[PDB]
Amino acid sequence: FTAVAEQVSAVLSQYGITGPNRAIYQGFGLKVARALNRLGGGPALVNMINGLKAYYISAFNANPTVLDAVTDIITGSPTGYVS
Numbered sequence: 001f002t003a004v005a006e007q008v009s010a011v012l013s014q015y016g017i018t019g020p021n022r023a024i025y026q027g028f029g030l031k032v033a034r035a036l037n038r039l040g041g042g043p044a045l046v047n048m049i050n051g052l053k054a055y056y057i058s059a060f061n062a063n064p065t066v067l068d069a070v071t072d073i074i075t076g077s078p079t080g081y082v083s
Helices: 002-015 019-039 043-060 064-075
Strands: none
Touching: 002 019, 002 064, 019 043, 019 064, 043 064
16 A cells, blocks of 8 residues: 555656646556455456556546556556466
């Protein structure tokens, strides 16, 4: 929880993201972390991550490169592969 927020913040720093837009990525990150915790690695988790990416891009104009980077720092892979 607090760790996830620090992990997202590290990515936001790299990309120079501040202000209200930070909340988009903190929210996405928390959802990815919860999915990983509940589902563990596998196609179900990849489904969830792919769905969240598409939704956040559509609904909030999230930056796809940043979403990949957040996925990577939380799961170990930009596309959510976990053994």
